[PDB]
Design a protein around this ligand. Structure first.
Ligand code: CLA
Ligand code: CLA
Ligand code: CLA
Ligand code: CLA
Ligand code: CLA
Ligand code: CLA
Ligand code: CLA
Ligand SMILES: CCCCCCCCCCCCCCCC(=O)OC[C@H](COP(=O)(O)OC[C@@H](O)CO)OC(=O)CCCCCCCCCCCCCCC
Ligand code: KC2
Ligand SMILES: CC1=C(C#C/C(C)=C/C=C/C(C)=C/C=C/C=C(C)/C=C/C=C(\C)C#CC2=C(C)C[C@@H](O)CC2(C)C)C(C)(C)C[C@H](O)C1
Ligand SMILES: CC1=C(C#C/C(C)=C/C=C/C(C)=C/C=C/C=C(C)/C=C/C=C(\C)C#CC2=C(C)C[C@@H](O)CC2(C)C)C(C)(C)C[C@H](O)C1
Lengths: 173, 177, 92
């Protein structure tokens, strides 16, 4: 079975209910642990990595006034290292840690079955009121987040190899 | 299920009875501690912080004639001022705490009399005559006390960092570093 | 007989066994893992741990954190191969 890997049996834990479930678990990592925990982790990684990829592009294109003086020619992890000394990364860490303590409460609720994985009730603009639109959006979110995990991996490792940001690399190569 | 943290369940203790409740207790302190004691502490902190923030703001501009009381910075003023006066204030505050509570000033004894949390009977001008008016004010005291707690925290830390008074630090922000 | 009941953690099951192998509840979070998965995990862990240990046997003043971390797979492989047996003899 396993539509994704046609020569392997469908993963036991994955029944196809969850969005973006193509029966993909060749190594059987869903058997170990709770699938709700893994989905929460996957959505966290998806959102974080797609924010990261968009941020890599946007930092390559535009930089806020006066950041050039602080970071010099640094790009990507070089910017990270430069601004850890300045203190920007510290403030980001403080605020993200606050949000993540509350996300810890959310995860504990999820494991008890009260909360759907990755659902923080964040819908200011109101997109997804219609159930079909919400389902489409969920699938799009999962797919784009996976693509973005791969994209950010590629960007960071291309910077490692060449020392060039994503779009600056793409321009010249 | 929580008005404030929509992705978390409503705290069991918070049921909308007490003014200022928006179902905000993500860490479950209400389950572990008496909500009446917590509200008493919240209102005491808010009142002290309101008075403290107004004190810093008024201090930086208005000073007593004496040199020892002419420091725009509140943190530096605390040490420039005579220590005897500070200890007198400490003792008077202790006496006021004792009397206002009634000597029953403990987690287990404070509310034996049954007085509502945050109600020490201090209403000299009798502004609580109108029940509706008292209710809204009761919320304002809470909202303004919370705002003042955070504001005074910012003031004192910004007085540690900049070394200037609150508004002086605000108006002297270093945009070019 | 008057002793108070002994409190145990939540979801505490009976793991006593007189069978050929334990009940696979002994493996906790890995109770549903396959015996083949455990076998491959044990072999990979043994190889990687041995390699990372050899990369650190003449320990220097600045050892590699990744090699230190991976060296802990050699002890891990033992547990994994024991689990493989347990899961093979429990039907999986
Ligand atoms: C994974 C996410 C991520 C991370 C870790 C960082 C990290 C960093 N960014 Mg940012 N950045 C991101 C996403 C991210 N970015 C995104 C999505 C954008 C596009 C809007 C940008 C655009 C951007 C610029 C233009 C610059 C940085 C810069 C920086 C550095 C200093 C912080 C700063 O000034 O941010 C400023 C970023 C913002 C004010 C936008 C943040 C928007 C958040 C992530 C989304 C909120 C959505 C909301 C809830 C709805 C730091 C290394 C500075 C730097 O040194 O660049 C080399 C800088 O000049 N970033
Ligand atoms: C690929 C983009 C994408 C998509 C399609 C969705 C889709 C969804 N998110 Mg969102 N989300 C995303 C990225 C995305 N998210 C990112 C990066 C973050 C981190 C900041 C979040 C954080 C987040 C939270 C915290 C929650 C959701 C939730 C939801 C659901 C309800 C809200 C909705 O209808 O959004 C509509 C989505 C769009 C209109 C697309 C946005 C595209 C923007 C405008 C472009 C970005 C430009 C860039 C910054 C420059 C829905 C399935 C809720 C839920 O129930 O999740 C399961 C929820 O609680 N999301
Ligand atoms: C010490 C001050 C203090 C105290 C005693 C309370 C007490 C209370 N608040 Mg809270 N509250 C405070 C400050 C305080 N508040 C502030 C400053 C704000 C403004 C943001 C609020 C805003 C607020 C709202 C909107 C609501 C409450 C409510 C309540 C009640 C239920 C929740 C609870 O158990 O809180 C107890 C909380 C504590 C004892 C504080 C614990 C602090 C921990 C141990 C450390 C915090 C460190 C640091 C400040 C956090 C940032 C860290 C960062 C560096 C990452 C309870 C009576 C709810 C209510 O009305 O219920 C009846 C309610 O709806 N509060
Ligand atoms: C409740 C918090 C609080 C605390 C801990 C302090 C502490 C202090 N104030 Mg006071 N002060 C406060 C509120 C507070 N103030 C308020 C609300 C006001 C506005 C009415 C003032 C107005 C004020 C002035 C004008 C001066 C001080 C000064 C001082 C210092 C000497 C004692 C004194 O003369 O007090 C006087 C206290 C009052 C007039 C109000 C007490 C009733 C509350 C001392 C560090 C002196 C100083 O060194 O300033 C730098 C000084 O010159 N304070
Ligand atoms: C109980 C009555 C009482 C008495 C006998 C004194 C006596 C004194 N106070 Mg005062 N003081 C009082 C109440 C009293 N205080 C109250 C209710 C407060 C507000 C909490 C203060 C706050 C205060 C401060 C902050 C200071 C004095 C100081 C003084 C001394 C000089 C001023 C003076 O002559 O008076 C003197 C020993 C000054 C001093 O140098 O004391 C050693 C001083 O700095 N007092
Ligand atoms: C020196 C005498 C004195 C005495 C007897 C008390 C007594 C009390 N204070 Mg404290 N307090 C004092 C000085 C004193 N205070 C001073 C000088 C300040 C600075 C303005 C405070 C500020 C303060 C706050 C902000 C709070 C207390 C609280 C309390 C109560 C609980 C204290 C405890 O150990 O728990 C109790 C009524 C807490 C309370 O009332 O909890 C319900 C509380 O939240 N006190
Ligand atoms: C409501 C209360 C309040 C207010 C009005 C302020 C106001 C201020 N704080 Mg803050 N502060 C507060 C509470 C508050 N603080 C608290 C509770 C703490 C914890 C102790 C701090 C700790 C703190 C520190 C350590 C510093 C400030 C600083 C500042 C100043 C610059 C901040 C800034 O632009 O950040 C820049 C970032 C933003 C404006 C982005 C805000 C986030 C999104 C976009 C909204 C400014 C006057 C700085 C200062 O005075 O430097 C000399 C500073 O270094 N504050
Ligand atoms: C080692 C040092 C450990 C001491 C830390 C003590 C912090 C106790 C903090 C603590 O739990 O106090 C909270 C307590 C009020 O809590 P409750 O109203 O639940 O009453 C406490 C008990 O009656 C019930 O446990 O405060 C008081 O009773 C006043 C004295 C303090
Ligand atoms: C729009 C919002 C905005 C953001 C989000 C943002 C973020 C960051 C970060 C990120 C963490 C850093 C690290 C950073 C650093 C510096 N900013 Mg900057 N900044 C913004 C706005 C302005 C404006 C209006 C000015 C300014 C400046 C400077 C100077 C001064 C250097 C010098 O003068 O030597 C330095 C070092 C001033 C300047 O010089 O601009 C020519 C100035 O006027 N920024 N800025
Ligand atoms: C949910 C929600 C909202 C929201 C929101 C927000 C803010 C949503 C933000 C969503 C974002 C920022 C999504 C970003 C996706 C990025 C991807 C897929 C990148 C792929 C990169 C790739 C494949 C690559 C690459 C590359 C590689 C590897 C090599 C490189 O040399 C270059 C190259 C490019 C070729 C709103 C605000 C609407 C409110 C609503 O009520 C709730
Ligand atoms: C009891 C009672 C009565 C009464 C009474 C009385 C006397 C009531 C007094 C109430 C008072 C003094 C309330 C003060 C609130 C102050 C706040 C919210 C300050 C916020 C500051 C912030 C956010 C800030 C800040 C800042 C920061 C952090 C950094 C700075 O660089 C910049 C800045 C300044 C912007 C009466 C007499 C009517 C009788 C009646 O029977 C009942």
């Amino acid at each position: 079975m396993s539509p994704s890997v046609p020569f392997l049996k469908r993963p036991v834990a994955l029944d196809g209910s969850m969005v973006g479930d193509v029966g993909f678990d060749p190594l059987g990592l869903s058997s170990v642990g709770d699938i709700k925990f893994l989905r929460e982790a996957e959505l966290k990684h998806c959102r974080l990595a797609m924010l990261a990829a968009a941020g890599s592009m946007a930092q390559d294109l535009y930089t806020f006034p006066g950041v050039d003086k602080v970071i010099g020619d640094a790009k990507m992890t070089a910017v990270h290292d430069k601004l850890v000394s300045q203190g920007a990364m510290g403030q980001l860490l403080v605020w993200i840690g606050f949000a993540e303590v509350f996300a810890t409460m959310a995860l504990f609720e999820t494991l008890d079955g009260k909360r759907a994985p990755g659902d923080f009730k964040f819908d200011p603009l109101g997109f997804g009121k219609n159930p079909e639109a919400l389902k489409r959006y969920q699938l799009a979110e999962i797919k784009n987040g996976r693509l973005a995990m791969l994209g950010f991996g590629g960007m960071v490792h291309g910077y490692f190899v060449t020392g060039k940001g994503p779009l600056e690399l793409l321009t010249n190569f | 299920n929580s008005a404030a943290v929509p992705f978390l369940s409503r705290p069991a203790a918070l049921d909308g009875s007490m003014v200022g409740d928006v179902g905000f207790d993500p860490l479950g302190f209400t389950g572990k501690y008496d909500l009446k004691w917590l509200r008493e502490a919240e209102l005491k902190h808010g009142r002290v912080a309101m008075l403290a923030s107004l004190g810093c703001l008024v201090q930086e501009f208005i000073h007593l004639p004496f040199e020892a009381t002419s420091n725009p910075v509140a943190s530096e003023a605390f040490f420039q001022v005579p220590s005897g006066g500070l200890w007198q204030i400490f003792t008077v505050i202790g006496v006021i705490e004792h009397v206002s509570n009634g000597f029953n000033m403990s987690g287990s004894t404070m509310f034996k009399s049954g007085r509502a949390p945050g109600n020490l009977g201090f209403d000299p001008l009798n502004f609580g005559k109108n029940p509706t008016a008292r209710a809204r004010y009761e919320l304002a005291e809470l909202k303004n006390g919370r705002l003042a707690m955070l504001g005074f925290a910012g003031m004192i830390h910004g007085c540690f960092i900049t070394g200037k008074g609150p508004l002086a630090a605000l108006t002297s922000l270093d945009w070019h570093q | 007989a008057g002793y108070s009941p002994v409190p145990s953690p939540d979801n505490t099951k009976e793991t006593y066994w007189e069978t050929k192998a334990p009940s696979s509840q002994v493996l906790g979070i890995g109770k549903d893992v396959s015996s083949g998965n455990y076998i491959v995990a044990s072999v990979v862990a043994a190889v990687v741990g041995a390699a990372c240990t050899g990369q650190c046997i003449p320990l220097t003043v600045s050892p590699n954190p990744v090699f230190i971390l991976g060296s802990f797979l050699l002890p891990y492989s033992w547990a994994l191969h024991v689990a493989a047996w347990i899961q093979r003899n429990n039907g999986k």
